[PDB]
PDB file of all heavy atoms in Angstrom:
ATOM      1  N   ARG A 105      11.380  66.028   4.733  1.00 25.64           N
ATOM      2  CA  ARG A 105      12.182  65.488   3.616  1.00 25.64           C
ATOM      3  C   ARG A 105      13.364  64.742   4.222  1.00 25.64           C
ATOM      4  O   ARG A 105      14.047  65.315   5.074  1.00 25.64           O
ATOM      5  CB  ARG A 105      12.651  66.598   2.684  1.00 25.64           C
ATOM      6  CG  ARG A 105      13.264  66.078   1.398  1.00 25.64           C
ATOM      7  CD  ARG A 105      13.691  67.251   0.554  1.00 25.64           C
ATOM      8  NE  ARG A 105      14.394  66.826  -0.646  1.00 25.64           N
ATOM      9  CZ  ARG A 105      13.828  66.545  -1.805  1.00 25.64           C
ATOM     10  NH1 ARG A 105      12.518  66.603  -1.942  1.00 25.64           N
ATOM     11  NH2 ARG A 105      14.580  66.158  -2.820  1.00 25.64           N
ATOM     12  N   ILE A 106      13.614  63.523   3.770  1.00 26.60           N
ATOM     13  CA  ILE A 106      14.738  62.714   4.307  1.00 26.60           C
ATOM     14  C   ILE A 106      15.956  62.847   3.397  1.00 26.60           C
ATOM     15  O   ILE A 106      15.818  63.251   2.231  1.00 26.60           O
ATOM     16  CB  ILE A 106      14.347  61.242   4.488  1.00 26.60           C
ATOM     17  CG1 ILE A 106      13.899  60.615   3.171  1.00 26.60           C
ATOM     18  CG2 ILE A 106      13.316  61.112   5.591  1.00 26.60           C
ATOM     19  CD1 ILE A 106      13.837  59.113   3.228  1.00 26.60           C
ATOM     20  N   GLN A 107      17.092  62.472   3.969  1.00 25.58           N
ATOM     21  CA  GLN A 107      18.430  62.409   3.353  1.00 25.58           C
ATOM     22  C   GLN A 107      18.614  61.053   2.692  1.00 25.58           C
ATOM     23  O   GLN A 107      18.115  60.047   3.193  1.00 25.58           O
ATOM     24  CB  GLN A 107      19.485  62.592   4.447  1.00 25.58           C
ATOM     25  CG  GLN A 107      19.564  64.023   4.947  1.00 25.58           C
ATOM     26  CD  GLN A 107      20.052  64.920   3.836  1.00 25.58           C
ATOM     27  OE1 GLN A 107      21.094  64.656   3.237  1.00 25.58           O
ATOM     28  NE2 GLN A 107      19.295  65.968   3.537  1.00 25.58           N
ATOM     29  N   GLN A 110      18.919  57.421   4.608  1.00 25.71           N
ATOM     30  CA  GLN A 110      17.931  57.291   5.708  1.00 25.71           C
ATOM     31  C   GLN A 110      16.850  56.305   5.263  1.00 25.71           C
ATOM     32  O   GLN A 110      16.667  56.116   4.031  1.00 25.71           O
ATOM     33  CB  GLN A 110      17.378  58.648   6.134  1.00 25.71           C
ATOM     34  CG  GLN A 110      18.377  59.480   6.939  1.00 25.71           C
ATOM     35  CD  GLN A 110      18.993  58.743   8.109  1.00 25.71           C
ATOM     36  OE1 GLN A 110      20.142  58.294   8.055  1.00 25.71           O
ATOM     37  NE2 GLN A 110      18.227  58.599   9.181  1.00 25.71           N
TER      38      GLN A 110
HETATM   39 CL1   CL B   1      16.894  62.041   7.014  1.00 16.61          CL
END
Side-chain angles (χ1 to χ4, degrees):
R105 190 180 175 89
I106 59 166
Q107 287 294 307
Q110 286 309 103

